[PDB]
């Protein structure tokens, strides 16, 4: 096959052939709208690895985000509290930039289900992503047991809750001693450790 070579070549982001392609494409985008549709994936190997198929009901969108930190929005710089939380500048957002891209694409196409997303480009001001979506009302989708699990009503707006690959990472859903506090849900676990249980025959 040919997608094996593409996977190897995509690792050499600092080579001459790849640096040229990234520079040219990053200019082509940023001349288009902030959110727009793509006719086909620009990374055929990466999208197929994440679940993309070439049949009716799969669509691709492209989006760019502002690529920085998060400034605390308050009138001027007053916080009206104690000195330990009066910082305004060097604070950070607890979700990823990749997550924000998925949420904004989901609102534009509100009849579709978000599957995954990947990185295509970046520069000093923006990062660029491509998002994969599936039509849950198309007949060719409801016919296939490998994908029709997404037509059920428990998967409405997965990206708004953290049920995509990037959402799982930020929640901390891994096994072992390092992920003690978040393994099964941070707020659920805190409630269990703070409950006073009284039995009948104490």
């Amino acid at each position: 096959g040919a997608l094996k070579y593409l996977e190897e070549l995509s690792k050499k982001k600092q080579s001459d052939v790849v640096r040229f392609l990234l520079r040219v494409r990053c200019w082509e985008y940023r001349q288009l709208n902030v959110i727009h549709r793509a006719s086909r994936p620009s990374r055929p190997d990466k999208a197929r690895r994440l679940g993309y198929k070439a049949k009716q009901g799969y669509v691709i969108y492209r989006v760019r985000v502002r690529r920085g930190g998060r400034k605390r929005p308050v009138p001027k710089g007053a916080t009206y509290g104690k000195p330990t939380n009066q910082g305004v500048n060097q604070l950070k957002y607890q979700r990823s930039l990749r997550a924000t891209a998925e949420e904004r694409v989901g609102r534009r196409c509100s009849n579709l289900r978000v599957l995954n997303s990947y990185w295509v480009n970046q520069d000093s001001t923006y990062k660029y992503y491509e998002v994969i979506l599936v039509d849950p009302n198309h007949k060719a989708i409801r016919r296939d047991p490998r994908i029709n699990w997404i037509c059920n009503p428990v998967h409405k707006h997965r990206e708004c809750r953290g049920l995509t690959s990037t959402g799982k990472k930020s929640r901390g859903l891994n096994k072992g001693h390092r992920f003690n506090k978040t393994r099964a849900g941070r707020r659920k676990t805190w409630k269990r450790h703070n409950t006073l249980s009284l039995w009948r025959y104490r």
Binding site: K191, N194, T195, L196, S197, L198, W199, R200
Partner: protein, 209 residues
């Protein structure tokens, strides 16, 4: 404040604890609900037992490694030794675990015998009653007294080793050469000095030539 001779108190009641208090007034009610579900489940599995066959396994720390209990499922090597295909096993009431390994001969032998005891007591009804197959019970043995627990009929017969036995005098063994206490001190001392002695021998041999 404190005023007399007391134990220093530490009562963790400085949050809004009254928002999270779980009483159990439904303890008898939940017990009735569980028994109804077990009775319904047993009726659905009409002649079959209500459980699965488990293997015997030993606990993992220096505390508790003297005892045995039931595990999750049989290994792939145990199933092959008994002669049971891995696809057939979970459809006749046997549990399977694909990530446990046999590091010894003791555990392997114990579980292999357990499987062939079960295979001897099994009754297989044919898929179609008018066309029985040569691997099915020939229906003259289909009538017998059965069990429906599999956790009492195939439990842990003895989890601990016998605590007392008797031997004839003059057959008692002789001790270790210097005594049991001295043997323990020597074994500890050797471990603390293994690195020092190896380095000393190495530099001596290198300086020899």
């Amino acid at each position: 404040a404190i005023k007399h001779n007391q134990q220093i108190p530490n009562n963790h009641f400085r949050k809004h604890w009254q928002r999270r208090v779980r009483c159990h007034f439904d303890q008898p009610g939940k017990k009735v609900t569980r028994r109804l579900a077990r009775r319904a489940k047993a009726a659905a599995l009409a002649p079959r037992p209500v459980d699965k066959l488990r293997p015997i396994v030993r606990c993992p720390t220096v505390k508790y490694n003297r005892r045995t209990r039931l595990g999750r499922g049989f290994t792939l090597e145990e199933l092959k030794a008994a002669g049971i295909p891995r696809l057939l096993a979970p459809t006749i009431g046997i549990a399977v675990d694909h990530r446990r390994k046999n590091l010894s001969e003791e555990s392997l032998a114990a579980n292999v015998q357990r499987l062939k005891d079960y295979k001897a007591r099994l009754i297989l009804f044919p898929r179609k009653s008018n066309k029985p197959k040569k691997a099915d019970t020939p229906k003259d043995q289909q009538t017998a007294e059965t069990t429906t627990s599999l956790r009492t009929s195939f439990g842990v017969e003895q989890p601990l080793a016998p605590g007392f036995t008797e031997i004839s005098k003059s057959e008692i063994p002789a001790g270790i050469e210097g005594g049991a206490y001295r043997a323990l001190r020597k074994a500890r001392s050797d471990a603390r000095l293994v690195g020092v002695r190896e380095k000393r021998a190495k530099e001596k041999a290198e300086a020899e030539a």
